[PDB]
Amino acid sequence: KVFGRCELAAAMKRHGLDNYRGYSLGNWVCAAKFESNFNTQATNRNTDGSTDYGILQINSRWWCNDGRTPGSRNLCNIPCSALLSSDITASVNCAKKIVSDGNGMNAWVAWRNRCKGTDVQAWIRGCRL
Template sequence: MKTLCLWLMPVLILLLLGLKQVESKKYQRCELTHVLVEKYNFDKSFISNWICLVEHESELNTSKITNMENKSKNYGLFQINSRGYCTEGKKGGQCNKKCEDFSNDDIGDDIACARMIQEREGFKYWKGWERSCRNQQNLPNLRVLCNLRSQSPSRSARGFITG
């Protein structure tokens, strides 16, 4: 009995540690478009830039981590860099986040940081956007491709909630 308990204890500990797995998600283009517009209120006039950026930075994959030549890493859907906007292993950087927090399926913190980066540095912060999305002709027409309505159903023409 004692031998069984000695063997079973490490197995149980490993199982419990395994329960806290990081979930990741690979989005489809239109799925992410609708999530960003409907859940996170992204401006529809810039949504094609954001989707193009994410497609060329992370291939729409929330768990992507890229090792950079300067020994830093880019994390998550928006490939946020560990040199300035987050810190590996602990909260820090300009977004005050652990970099690893950007590599799971909770994209709320990624979005908050990406919006701050875009406000400060513009889309040019992202090399994938610079290479592939800067020319407006290269942007996907998400209104057609993803059936993106010009107005959300709960908003009036001015953008205020009706009712």
Template sequence: MKIWVLLLLVAAVSTKRFTKCELVRTLKAAGMDDFFSVKHLLYLIFTYLIGMYTEHYGIFQINNRRWCSDGKFPGKKDCPFTCNQLFSLQNSIDCAKIIVQKLGMTPWKGWRYECWGQDVSKYVAGCGV
């Protein structure tokens, strides 16, 4: 019981909440604009982050079939992380960079069907970018 409480406490302490603009600045500082427009990434995050998928991990909802390993789909994965490691923002950023380098934004179906070619500047409005 004490270990469970300790794990919950550690998880609660290590969780970082971002305002929209803090997240924009964090993604820009991590070089995400060099890979794909931060405003499109924010669209993806704000539209699809809310537990829509059970087989997608981290802030960018990265799929476990090709990109990360959770034991359900054997084989080599393109990102060097387990799926649970994608709950680290830095690991998610690093994996998203790999995905965008290989395939652009097309692996994210929501982006492909609803965002591609749309004006999504409202997602970074007021953040000075």
């Protein structure tokens, strides 16, 4: 599934991401835009053998188990195929662990490269909330 911008903002707010661990909702929308172009099926392979899964590109080395990644830790305790669902609940629940791990949203390269330091509130502008 490919989400619309406001459609995803509403969905992420329902799941408690707004201001979660100090990060306003626009952060999460902006990260999803540049991590996955709002697509729940985006996947990307890395040089370390890991893969990034789903709308928030959760990485198979630390967070989810995909059965093909050496050194897997599965800190979210979830198979990576559950993060390719059209329903974002499992991606959101894993994202909440990741941000509480220590370095906040810096785990998302696209967020810290192209979102952080801009006005991310603009990503929820005009959305029914």
